[PDB]
Amino acid sequence: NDDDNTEIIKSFKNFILEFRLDSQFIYRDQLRNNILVKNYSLTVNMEHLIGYNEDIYKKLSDEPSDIIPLFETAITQVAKRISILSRASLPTFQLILNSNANQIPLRDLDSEHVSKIVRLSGIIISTSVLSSRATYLSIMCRNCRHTTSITINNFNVSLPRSCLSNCGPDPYIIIHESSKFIDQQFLKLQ
Amino acid sequence: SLPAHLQQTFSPEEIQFIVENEPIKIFPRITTRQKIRHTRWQLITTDDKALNNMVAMRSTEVVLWIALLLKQQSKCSIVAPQWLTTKELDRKIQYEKTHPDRFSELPWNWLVLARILFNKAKDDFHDPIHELRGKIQDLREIRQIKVLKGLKYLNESHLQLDNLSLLEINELRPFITEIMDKLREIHTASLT
Amino acid sequence: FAPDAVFGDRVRRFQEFLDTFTSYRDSVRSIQVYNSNNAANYNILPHRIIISLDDLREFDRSFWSGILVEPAYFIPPAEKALTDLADSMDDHPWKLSFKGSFGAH
Amino acid sequence: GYYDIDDVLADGTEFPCKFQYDIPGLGYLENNPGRPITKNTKLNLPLWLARILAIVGPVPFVELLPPDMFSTKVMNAIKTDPVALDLHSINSHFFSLAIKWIMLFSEKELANVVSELLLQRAQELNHHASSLSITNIATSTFLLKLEEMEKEIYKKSHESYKDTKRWMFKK
Amino acid sequence: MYGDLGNKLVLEAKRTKQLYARSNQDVNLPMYHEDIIRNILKEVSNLRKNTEYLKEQQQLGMLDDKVAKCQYFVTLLCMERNKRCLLAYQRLRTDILDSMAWNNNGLDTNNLSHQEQEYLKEYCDLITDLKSGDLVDIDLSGSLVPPSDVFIDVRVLKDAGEIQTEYGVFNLIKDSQFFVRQSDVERLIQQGYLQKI
Amino acid sequence: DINIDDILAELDKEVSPQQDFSDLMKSWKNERCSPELLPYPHQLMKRLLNRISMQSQLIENISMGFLDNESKLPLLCMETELERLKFVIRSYIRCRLSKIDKFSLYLRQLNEDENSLISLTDLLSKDEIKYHDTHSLIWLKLVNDSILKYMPEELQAINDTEGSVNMIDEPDWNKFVFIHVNGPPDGKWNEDPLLQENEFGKPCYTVTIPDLKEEVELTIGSIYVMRYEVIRDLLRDDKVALI
Numbered sequence A: 001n002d003d004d005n006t007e008i009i010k011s012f013k014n015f016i017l018e019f020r021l022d023s024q025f026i027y028r029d030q031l032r033n034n035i036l037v038k039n040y041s042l043t044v045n046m047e048h049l050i051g052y053n054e055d056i057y058k059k060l061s062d063e064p065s066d067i068i069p070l071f072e073t074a075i076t077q078v079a080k081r082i083s084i085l086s087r088a089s090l091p092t093f094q095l096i097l098n099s100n101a102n103q104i105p106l107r108d109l110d111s112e113h114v115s116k117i118v119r120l121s122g123i124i125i126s127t128s129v130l131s132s133r134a135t136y137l138s139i140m141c142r143n144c145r146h147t148t149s150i151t152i153n154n155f156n157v158s159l160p161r162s163c164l165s166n167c168g169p170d171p172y173i174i175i176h177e178s179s180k181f182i183d184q185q186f187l188k189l190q
Numbered sequence B: 001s002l003p004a005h006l007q008q009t010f011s012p013e014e015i016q017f018i019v020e021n022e023p024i025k026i027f028p029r030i031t032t033r034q035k036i037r038h039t040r041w042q043l044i045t046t047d048d049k050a051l052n053n054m055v056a057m058r059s060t061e062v063v064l065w066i067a068l069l070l071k072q073q074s075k076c077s078i079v080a081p082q083w084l085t086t087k088e089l090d091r092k093i094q095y096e097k098t099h100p101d102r103f104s105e106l107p108w109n110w111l112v113l114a115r116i117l118f119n120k121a122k123d124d125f126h127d128p129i130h131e132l133r134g135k136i137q138d139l140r141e142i143r144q145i146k147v148l149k150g151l152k153y154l155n156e157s158h159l160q161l162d163n164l165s166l167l168e169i170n171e172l173r174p175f176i177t178e179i180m181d182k183l184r185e186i187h188t189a190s191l192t
Numbered sequence C: 001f002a003p004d005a006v007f008g009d010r011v012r013r014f015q016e017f018l019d020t021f022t023s024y025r026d027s028v029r030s031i032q033v034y035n036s037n038n039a040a041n042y043n044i045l046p047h048r049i050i051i052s053l054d055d056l057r058e059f060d061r062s063f064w065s066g067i068l069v070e071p072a073y074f075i076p077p078a079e080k081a082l083t084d085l086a087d088s089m090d091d092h093p094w095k096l097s098f099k100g101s102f103g104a105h
Numbered sequence D: 001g002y003y004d005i006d007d008v009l010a011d012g013t014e015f016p017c018k019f020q021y022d023i024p025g026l027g028y029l030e031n032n033p034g035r036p037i038t039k040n041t042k043l044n045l046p047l048w049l050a051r052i053l054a055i056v057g058p059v060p061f062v063e064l065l066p067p068d069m070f071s072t073k074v075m076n077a078i079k080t081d082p083v084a085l086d087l088h089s090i091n092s093h094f095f096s097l098a099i100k101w102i103m104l105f106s107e108k109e110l111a112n113v114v115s116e117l118l119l120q121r122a123q124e125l126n127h128h129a130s131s132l133s134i135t136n137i138a139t140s141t142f143l144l145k146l147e148e149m150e151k152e153i154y155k156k157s158h159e160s161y162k163d164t165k166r167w168m169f170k171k
Numbered sequence E: 001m002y003g004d005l006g007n008k009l010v011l012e013a014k015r016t017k018q019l020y021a022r023s024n025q026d027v028n029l030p031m032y033h034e035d036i037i038r039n040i041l042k043e044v045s046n047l048r049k050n051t052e053y054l055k056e057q058q059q060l061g062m063l064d065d066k067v068a069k070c071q072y073f074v075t076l077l078c079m080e081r082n083k084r085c086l087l088a089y090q091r092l093r094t095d096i097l098d099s100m101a102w103n104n105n106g107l108d109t110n111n112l113s114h115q116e117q118e119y120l121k122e123y124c125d126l127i128t129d130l131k132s133g134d135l136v137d138i139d140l141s142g143s144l145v146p147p148s149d150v151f152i153d154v155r156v157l158k159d160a161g162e163i164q165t166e167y168g169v170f171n172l173i174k175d176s177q178f179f180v181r182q183s184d185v186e187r188l189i190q191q192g193y194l195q196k197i
Numbered sequence F: 001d002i003n004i005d006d007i008l009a010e011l012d013k014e015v016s017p018q019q020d021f022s023d024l025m026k027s028w029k030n031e032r033c034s035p036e037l038l039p040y041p042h043q044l045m046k047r048l049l050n051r052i053s054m055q056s057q058l059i060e061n062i063s064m065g066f067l068d069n070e071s072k073l074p075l076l077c078m079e080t081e082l083e084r085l086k087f088v089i090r091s092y093i094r095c096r097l098s099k100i101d102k103f104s105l106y107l108r109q110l111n112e113d114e115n116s117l118i119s120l121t122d123l124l125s126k127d128e129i130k131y132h133d134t135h136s137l138i139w140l141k142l143v144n145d146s147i148l149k150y151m152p153e154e155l156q157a158i159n160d161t162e163g164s165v166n167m168i169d170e171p172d173w174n175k176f177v178f179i180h181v182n183g184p185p186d187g188k189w190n191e192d193p194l195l196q197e198n199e200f201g202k203p204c205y206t207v208t209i210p211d212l213k214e215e216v217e218l219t220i221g222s223i224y225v226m227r228y229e230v231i232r233d234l235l236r237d238d239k240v241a242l243i
């Protein structure tokens, strides 16, 4: 299915590169301007994604936990294509969503909304300290020092159970110098 | 007597006004060449002769503001210049990607004229206009990368920018001139 | 890149830095002779040197930015060079410490 | 220029002056007209006055001690991280004052360092000037750290970019 | 110290320049600071009396070649500083008045000093002399946006009845809309009776 | 084969309003971008103003004819032509009046200096002279009554060069400007004495940056950011024009 994922990625790349209203390429402009001020994210209004090609929105809303990382990947590739002269390094870009889907009040959310994109509102009653989550883990086997890696999308991974070619039962460890991390924060919404 | 924002630069409308003085090729949809077998254009800034001798769909060359005036009505079509076709813009894009330092030799008015004609003559292009807009955007983005590289090499001495557009220059002008002026004033002040 | 290959270059570059700014060698020997004298007649100073990041910047900006951005690769050879210098002074690992102008850090 | 307001304010900043003579009557600079200023009185004077008493006097009436804004501490902070530096806190007119100081005493090191400082900050200033809405907090936290000189360059540059974007995409 | 009031005045100058610069319109400039200017001119008179007192006492001549020279230098430089501050303030407000003259009167009064009121009168008279002698074929006070269109649509924003133009009329009915030559209506756009472009 | 293009040239050989408008555009661009007040195009402006007068009379006469074969479209083109041209003259004059405002005391000094290589009536228009003189008097009257009345006679001069700051603002001669190198306006590269071959066999002008004691080769058909004083005589001879 990697060809299918590649076609999802290329579909999103085409959405960034082609979406235009009133003579302005709004997402090319926004992505470039975001790169200049060195915030590596893109704010996408899903009204525009629906208006471009609703098949993409249908894929996104059917399973966002698989589709959102592909959209993020597409944003990285376009970011490089519009800010670096290739044949003469940026992180994984965050996707940010704007929406006007009808709100589900916080009490009505239940088991039928699991893994759906949801829009809600409330009062933030607490905001935890920042915490570090891994995006890229550099990984080493404790016995043979076979090295590998895990590239992580934070939408829901673990260390491998045994060595990927005796080598011990549960052998892998993290190389904390080469591994890449991101800020994560917890909020409570009432 | 001159506003602050016009003191040492041109407004983009003045850049447009400059570009509108360029000749452009049109297909007339009126005939003004009276046969041998009435009001004449009688201009004082530009070539009166071409407009008095138009014949419908014999292509001819006139100043761009007159072509826009005739294209505000249905009385001509503006022939997009040869560089603005898809294949030529793609060649310029390949040049830009192949030479990381040089700017490609697009004409000085390229962004201004692309904007003007994509708005006022969107129907006259042989190629699909969304591709022309896409490739003009590709060129502006790639050229902006090259500009941002070039500004790392600002001097107290001078600078060279071979094929940078009138609009791109006019957009950069206050920044570049002010920064190079201050670098000069730092350097000259240090002299005995 | 494998750090172990360039480790020797980093050791000799920090040794050149120590030679260039001799006040660090003088401080190393000051610590040593103080400890020797306290051992000589029955207080001990530690095997630590505070180096200026400004001196290291003016010496080698590439090494200095290596210390700031990649200390896990640049501190151990710098401390090895310091330990070798202390060992070259007449008659245990020596440690580095830092001062000045960290900027964004 | 003469009527240039940001120059007039820059001339109004104060520098530490050490006097080379005993002079009667000047005690109003020490807030008492009735007494002399002594030799080796160390006194903060406005630059419009200190510039002239530093040259006229033969030994001049005043020697200018190194101001703290050009101390080796500040110069080191400049030479590490130009874009992270809060020049507006150091002195709101630091570039104009550095130009004046470089001219008053020919100091090649300060000229080189200030050239590097301005150039490296000019890159970041252009990045924030070119970015446009369709404003970012990253821009706001950077603009707080700009001198009046750099604020004028940023305003003019950002207006140029904004006006161009307006003309391109609007009618 | 003698220069402090000058700093306060040119801080006023800097703030009014920003007040004019930040907005898109011509903001009507703020009140002329007669109080601070009176304080500075009184300080100048103090400094003049100090020079007179010193130059009288130079006939007694206390270490005059250095001491009286130095005293005279400092009290002269205080007057140079205060002259610079005063002229900076007045030159800024003069520039704004000239800009306003071209932008409006060549086609809030309490805030001006009476010298500035009669200055503005004379500068407007000068502008109207320039667009009356030679070069009168061009209204030199007209717009500096280049003419983008020869015909425009304009919506009547305030009623002004039937008025003539060179070969016709407009009846400026409230919330009527014309389609008309721009050169025949620009005067009314500037006067705020017509809305568009 | 034997080349004959010169033979064919000698077979082939067997002021205009368009040129004046192009010259006005050149003057307007150079004026807008330069720090100096450039010398007034006396004859060009005289003839342009005559044309604007006669063209206005023509458009009016045709309008009277319409009121007394008919198509209005050329008439519309003539109307908007005069609008565009009168805009350029308006913008040009307004700009150099702003320069006269900035440099009023420096221009007065140039008129005072009997050794000046420029007389003010070379540099300025008659209307600009009217403006400079009477604006200078009116500004002088304002600051005389408001400020200089109260100063000592050491300091009542409005233009003191010996002060702790020079009161006379002058053009920033080494201001950086953008230029595009024309070459000679005719294609007579062999006639131009300053034009010369660069390496890689292409023409250029070499100029000296005197502070840096350094030379730079301004190639034809390319754009440079240059100190204005360095390029100034090339600009005077139209060998470069300001972007």
Ligand SMILES: [Zn+2]
Binding pocket: A141, A142, A143, A144, A145, A146, A163, A164, A165, A167, A171
């Ligand atoms: Zn293993």
